[PDB]
């Protein structure tokens, strides 16, 4: 209280955000403290539940509907003049049940990043990668290496030929109809597991192992968001950001996320938070500070977006974003991501078959909302 504590994921520009916090503290005298706890996405509703935590919380829009549903976030009330400074579709990203629950920051989408030196020409397809790997393995390199621990990175493939989260119908998602176990999704996950079985990829490659490999030039390509371009710029690797490879002739459909800023409902500093977000962060000068630390992607602020338009990397992010679809923000998104995280890993580690893994994934009661027991509640 009387100050501002912000939580932002560790892969974002928290130091750039901290710089905005000093500009604020210089004007208001209010100390802004930026933090980046591990697993904050799930640590937040754990603490905020007890009326504890940060005043402002950053994270992609998909989790906000759940927080909103449990009364963990304060309703946003920007003046119409301010609302017109951001792109309309980004406001809809953070609109839960008709009420605004967060401030949009930037549009994010996964892209295919490759080393122009080892791979002067990026694979047009997913199918030609195993052939490309063997070529490079011979030279002592790899063709592809990305974070397999988070289904956010593997989804583009699973969705390319047909997989989907929830069936959007009648202006509303259907939680009983999940499409993670359909033919298109199985086709996609199967392909990824074959890569693993054929020793093209490691089942346990995470974000850091992958990043290090690409940055040190030990692998030809990687799949990552805009925030990753900074470490690569410093690694001095000659890279390129381009469209994700297609699968079965169908483009990869990543789940587009809108970086959002939400105010803790139990926050005494609500009006302070509003001043910081609207008057200091969401400005050309504010966004820049952050961007310079670690690129946001395609910022929602119209004024600063026009400047970022001339960046070829941003253009590619936009192309990939166009082929995918914005993540739903329904309360069930957390259960879904977990169900899929489990299925992808079970399938990847051979603990389960793809058909078995995905099936159990679409039947998770935590996503469906119900369960039909074999017997019932009684006793004889
Ligand atoms: O792996 C499932 C998670 O995917 C997304 O998380 C993204 C986030 O949108 C993005 O801003 C950040 O840079 O990367 C993470 C993936 O590590 C969802 O938004 C999460 O809710 C899911 O748990």
Swiss-Prot record:
Keywords, ordered alphabetically: Periplasm, Signal, Sugar transport, Transport
**Gene3D superfamilies referenced in this protein's UniProt entry, alphabetically:** Periplasmic binding protein-like II (3.40.190.10)
Q: Which family, according to the similarity comment?
A: Belongs to the bacterial solute-binding protein 1 family.
| Biological role | Part of the ABC transporter complex MalEFGK involved in maltose/maltodextrin import. Binds maltose and higher maltodextrins.
Q: Which organism is it from?
A: Escherichia coli O157:H7
Where in or outside the cell it occurs: the entry states: Periplasm
Q: Which gene encodes it?
A: malE
Q: Which domain of life is it from?
A: Bacteria
What InterPro entries does UniProt report for this protein, alphabetically? Maltose/Cyclodextrin-bd, SBP, SBP_1_CS
Q: Which GO terms describe its molecular function?
A: carbohydrate transmembrane transporter activity; maltose binding
- Its protein name is Maltose/maltodextrin-binding periplasmic protein
Q: Which PROSITE patterns match?
A: SBP_BACTERIAL_1
Q: CDD domains, per this entry?
A: PBP2_MBP
Q: How does it assemble?
A: The complex is composed of two ATP-binding proteins (MalK), two transmembrane proteins (MalG and MalF) and a solute-binding protein (MalE).
């Amino acid at each position: 209280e009387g100050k501002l504590v912000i939580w932002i994921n560790g892969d974002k520009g928290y130091n750039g955000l901290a710089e905005v916090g000093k500009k604020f503290e210089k004007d208001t005298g209010i100390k802004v403290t930026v933090e980046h706890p591990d697993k904050l996405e799930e640590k937040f509703p754990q603490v905020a539940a007890t009326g504890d935590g940060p005043d402002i919380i950053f994270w992609a829009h998909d989790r906000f509907g759940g927080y909103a549903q449990s009364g963990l976030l304060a309703e946003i009330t920007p003046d119409k003049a301010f609302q017109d400074k951001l792109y309309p579709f980004t406001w809809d990203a953070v609109r839960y049940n008709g009420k605004l629950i967060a401030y949009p920051i930037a549009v994010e989408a996964l892209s295919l990043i490759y080393n122009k030196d080892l791979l002067p020409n990026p694979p047009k397809t997913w199918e030609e990668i195993p052939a490309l790997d063997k070529e490079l393995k011979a030279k002592g390199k790899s063709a592809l290496m990305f974070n397999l621990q988070e289904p956010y990175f593997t989804w583009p493939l699973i969705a390319a030929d047909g997989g989907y989260a929830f069936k959007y119908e009648n202006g509303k998602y259907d939680i009983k109809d999940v499409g993670v176990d359909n033919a298109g999704a199985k086709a996609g996950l199967t392909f990824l597991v074959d890569l693993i079985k054929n020793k093209h990829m490691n089942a346990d490659t995470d974000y850091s192992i992958a990043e290090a490999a690409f940055n040190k030039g030990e692998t030809a390509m990687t799949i990552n968001g805009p925030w990753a371009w900074s470490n690569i710029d410093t690694s001095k690797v000659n890279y390129g950001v381009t469209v994700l490879p297609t699968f079965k002739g169908q483009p990869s459909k990543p789940f587009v996320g809108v970086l959002s800023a939400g105010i803790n409902a139990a926050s005494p500093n609500k009006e302070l938070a509003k001043e910081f977000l609207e008057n200091y962060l969401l400005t050309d000068e504010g966004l820049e500070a952050v961007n310079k630390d670690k690129p946001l992607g395609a910022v929602a602020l119209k004024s600063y977006e026009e400047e970022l338009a001339k960046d070829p990397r941003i253009a590619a992010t936009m192309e990939n974003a166009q082929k995918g679809e914005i993540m739903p923000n329904i309360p069930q998104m957390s259960a879904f991501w977990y169900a899929v995280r489990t299925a992808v890993i079970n399938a990847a580690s051979g603990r389960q078959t793809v058909d078995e893994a995905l099936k159990d994934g679409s039947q998770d009661p935590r996503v469906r909302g119900l369960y039909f027991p074999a017997g019932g509640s009684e006793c004889c």
